[PDB]
């Protein structure tokens, strides 16, 4: 159950790479850093050939999903490859219906009041807020009032200086697609440890 997994870890790797090899080296650096929730953006060359080969980490408690899924064809490949969850940059309907039938956790992207309501009426209680750096924590606070039953996972602009502010506002988890991926495997692992300690400290 993804809802419980998100609460337990409160952070997502949001992995990006330009190759199969980079994606694997990064995934190991991140996982070893204490970050269990990992998704691979479906832009990585042969991204599906990476997801299917991280089964070994699932056995270690890792959760492997796929990100930046914009169409159902990409979703179908990700699901067949063993993706545990699907994340979109926007709010589709075709992907949602497909995932629903398959039983795959799906999280649509939103930014506006109308997108929120539409997604809510489709049974989505967890929404991805993107770009998060544009609207900021005030968006979540504003929505909390009229929509107390909607949880958010903001992605982008998240760093060690403002990660606690997001949690103070009240979020489920934070997506870090820069400070938790850029650099060498040895550097990434260090960054991962800083994020885990900082989040645990504040919450």
Which one is catalytic: 39, 84, 151, 191?
39
Structure tokens at 106: 């799906």
Tell me how many degrees the CA angle 109-114-118 measures, rounded to the nearest 5.
Answer: 70
Is 197 assigned a catalytic role?
no
After which residues do gaps appear in the chain, with C to N over 2.5 Å?
A: none
Q: Is 183 in the site for its own copies (CB under 8 A)?
A: no
Q: How far is the CB of 167 from its own copies (least distance, A)?
A: 19
Question: Residues 114-153 vs its own copies: string with x where CB under 8 A?
Answer: xxxx------------xx-xxxx-xx--xx-xx-x-----
Cβ at position 134, least distance to its own copies in Å: 5
Interaction between residue 193 and its own copies (CB under 8 A): yes
Q: What is the DSSP string of 58-126?
A: HTTT-EEEEE---SHHHHHHHHHTT-SEEE-SS--SHHHHHHHHHT-EEE-EE-SHHHHHHHHTTT--E
Which is nearer to its own copies, 7 or 150 (by Cβ)? 150
- Rule CB under 8 A: say whether 177 interacts with its own copies: yes
The catalytic residues are: 39, 128
């Amino acid at each position: 159950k993804m809802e419980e997994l998100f609460k337990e870890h409160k952070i997502v790797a949001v992995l990006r790479a330009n190759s199969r090899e980079e994606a694997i080296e990064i995934a190991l650096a991140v996982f070893a850093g204490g970050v269990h929730l990992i998704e691979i953006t479906f832009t990585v060359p042969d991204a599906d050939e990476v997801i299917k080969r991280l089964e070994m980490l699932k056995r270690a408690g890792a959760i492997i999903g796929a990100g930046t899924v914009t169409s159902v064809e990409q979703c179908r490949e990700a699901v067949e490859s063993g993706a545990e969850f699907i994340v979109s940059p926007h709010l589709d309907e075709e992907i949602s219906q497909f995932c629903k039938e398959e039983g795959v956790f799906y999280m649509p992207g939103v930014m506006t009041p109308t997108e929120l309501v539409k997604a809510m009426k489709l049974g989505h209680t967890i929404l991805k807020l993107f770009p998060g750096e544009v609207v900021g924590p005030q968006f979540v606070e504003a929505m909390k009032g009229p929509f107390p039953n909607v949880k958010f996972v903001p992605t982008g602009g998240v760093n060690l200086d403002n990660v606690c502010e997001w949690f103070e506002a009240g979020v489920l988890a934070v997506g870090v697609g820069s400070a938790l991926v850029e650099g060498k495997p040895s550097e990434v692992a260090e960054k991962a440890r800083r994020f885990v300690k900082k989040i645990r400290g504040c919450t």
